[PDB]
Design a protein around this ligand. Sequence first.
Ligand code: HEC
Ligand code: HEC
Ligand SMILES: [Zn+2]
Lengths: 136, 136
Amino acid sequence: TKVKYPDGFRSWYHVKSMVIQPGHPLENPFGGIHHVYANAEAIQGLRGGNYPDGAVLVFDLFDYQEDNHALVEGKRKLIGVMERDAKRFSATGGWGYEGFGEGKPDKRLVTDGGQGCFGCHAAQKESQYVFSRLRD
Amino acid sequence: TKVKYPDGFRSWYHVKSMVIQPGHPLENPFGGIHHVYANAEAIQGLRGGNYPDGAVLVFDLFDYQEDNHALVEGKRKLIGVMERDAKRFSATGGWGYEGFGEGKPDKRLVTDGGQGCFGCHAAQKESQYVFSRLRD
Ligand code: HEC
Ligand code: HEC
Ligand SMILES: [Zn+2]
C-alpha cells in the first residue's frame, strides 16, 4: 500500500516546467524550479485516454539561485510522485501520493497516507486529479 | 551542409533548464525559459565519451508570464540545434548550427553557415563546444 520509488524517471518524458518564487502560496514546500515527467502509461492519460494502472507522474523540484537576473538550477529539494492503482489506492481516488526528500529512496515525506496531497489534487477531479497539460 | 529538423526531440532526454530574465546580458535574444534535450548519441558525449556523428543537442526557448510569484511557460520563441558531423561541419568545429523560428521546420534563421553561433560556442572548445553539463 506504499508508493514505489520511480527508478529511471529522469529518462522519462518531460511534460512541462514551472517556477514557483518566494511569495507564492505553494512556496512551502514547493518553491523552486520544477519539472514534470511521465512514463509511457501516464502519457496515454495526458493524451486523452484513461490513466491505466502503473501510470506514474513525477514532480522534480530544484532549488535555484538568482545570479544577474538568470535563474540557475541548484540542488534537488524533493520529488513528488503519483502512482496509478485504482484498487490499492482507492482511498485517495486511485492515485498513491508520496514524497522523497532530495529524490532519495530512503526519505519518505508523507505521514498521513496521502490525504494532504489528495485534498488539493481533488479540485482536478474533472481531469483525473492531474493539473499538468501536455503542451507541444 | 544543412542541419536537419530534429523530429521528436520533445521525447528525448531532458538535460537541464535555465531562465534568463530582463537585465541579464543575454535577454536579447535568449530571454525566457529554456530547456536542453539530447538524443542517445549526444548522451554518450555528455557522459564523458566522445560525440558520435549524428549526436544532436536542442535548445528549446519559451517566453514566460509572471503569474502571482510564478513564471509560467508561454509561446515557443524558437529552437536552436547542434548536429554533430566532423566532416560535413568541419567549418564550425564539427557541429552544424541552425535555428527554427517558433520551432517550425520552415523558419530557418541561420544565414552565415552558423559562424555567428560558433564564435560564442568556441569559448567552450575544451568541452567540444557544449556549455551544458549533465546533472542527476
Ligand atoms: C495544492 C495545495 C497542492 C498540494 C497540497 C499538492 N499539490 Fe501536487 N500539484 C499541485 C499543482 C498546482 C500542480 C501543478 C504544477 C504545474 O507545473 O502545473 C501539482 C502537480 C503535481 C504533480 C505532477 C502532476 C500534475 O498533477 O500536474 C505531482 C506528481 C504532484 N503534484 C504530487 C503531489 C504530492 C505527492 C503531494 C503531497 C505530498 C502534492 N502533490 C500536493 C497542487 C498541489
Ligand atoms: C553566446 C553569445 C551564444 C550564442 C551566440 C549562441 N549560443 Fe548557444 N549557448 C550559449 C550558452 C551559454 C548555452 C548554455 C545554456 C545553458 O542552459 O547552459 C548555449 C547552449 C546551446 C545549445 C544547447 C547545448 C549547449 O551547448 O549547452 C544549443 C543547441 C545551442 N546553444 C545552439 C545555438 C545556436 C544554433 C546558436 C546560433 C543560432 C547559438 N547557440 C548561439 C551561448 C550562445
Ligand atoms: Zn505578492
